[PDB]
């Protein structure tokens, strides 16, 4: 796609490491700093995706 | 009739669903919600009426749920003609690599 193609994602950050052949599908943010947002996403609350 | 295995049972976490039939089984994985509403009758007493068929009323929601299987039944409901003699029915559960 001329303009590039963002159908194509991968997760960024977890709790912890992943357990060998075991999909981790979900929906919420990830609790880094000090903040842990409940869906606002805001400052220190990057999406995983 | 079966068992449930999971974590936190909502349309959150994937989840299994196994149900084990008259000689069938239908063990699936989805995101439902919930199933827990069996419509329990006034008069579910056995004494009075055992009739209860087809009670499940389960996978009310499936939002991103693909995966099923059927296979032939599990538990083989055998009589040794008489009560004293119950199916001493064993079975053991672990989950290492699927
Ligand atoms: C459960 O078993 C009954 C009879 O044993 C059968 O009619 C029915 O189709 C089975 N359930 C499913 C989902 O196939
Ligand atoms: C038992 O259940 C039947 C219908 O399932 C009902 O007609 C009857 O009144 C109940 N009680 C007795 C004592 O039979
Ligand atoms: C899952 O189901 C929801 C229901 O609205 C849908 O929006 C979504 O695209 C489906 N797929 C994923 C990967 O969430």
Same mark, same amino acid.
């Given at each position: 796609?001329?303009?590039?193609?963002?159908?194509?994602?991968?997760?960024?950050?977890?709790?912890?490491?992943?357990?060998?052949?075991?999909?981790?599908?979900?929906? @919420? /943010?990830?609790?880094?700093?000090?903040?842990?947002?409940?869906?606002?996403?805001?400052?220190?609350?990057?999406?995983?995706? | 009739?079966?068992? /449930?295995?999971?974590?936190?049972?909502?349309?959150?976490?994937?989840?299994?669903?196994?149900?084990?039939?008259?000689?069938?089984?239908? /063990?699936?994985?989805? @995101?439902?919600?919930?199933?827990?509403?069996?419509?329990?009758?006034?008069?579910?007493?056995?004494?009075?009426?055992?009739?209860?068929?087809? @009670?499940?009323?389960?996978?009310?929601?499936?939002?991103?749920?693909?995966?099923?299987?059927?296979?032939?039944?599990?538990?083989?409901?055998?009589?040794?003609?008489?009560?004293?003699?119950?199916?001493?029915?064993?079975?053991?559960?672990?989950?290492?690599?699927?």
């Amino acid at each position: 796609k001329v303009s590039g193609n963002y159908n194509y994602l991968y997760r960024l950050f977890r709790k912890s490491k992943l357990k060998p052949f075991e999909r981790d599908i979900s929906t @919420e /943010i990830y609790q880094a700093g000090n903040k842990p947002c409940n869906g606002v996403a805001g400052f220190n609350c990057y999406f995983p995706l | 009739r079966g068992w /449930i295995f999971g974590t936190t049972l909502d349309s959150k976490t994937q989840s299994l669903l196994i149900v084990n039939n008259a000689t069938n089984v239908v /063990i699936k994985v989805c @995101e439902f919600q919930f199933c827990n509403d069996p419509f329990l009758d006034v008069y579910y007493h056995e004494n009075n009426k055992s009739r209860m068929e087809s @009670e499940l009323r389960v996978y009310s929601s499936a939002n991103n749920c693909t995966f099923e299987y059927v296979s032939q039944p599990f538990l083989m409901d055998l009589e040794g003609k008489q009560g004293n003699f119950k199916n001493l029915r064993e079975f053991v559960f672990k989950n290492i690599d699927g």
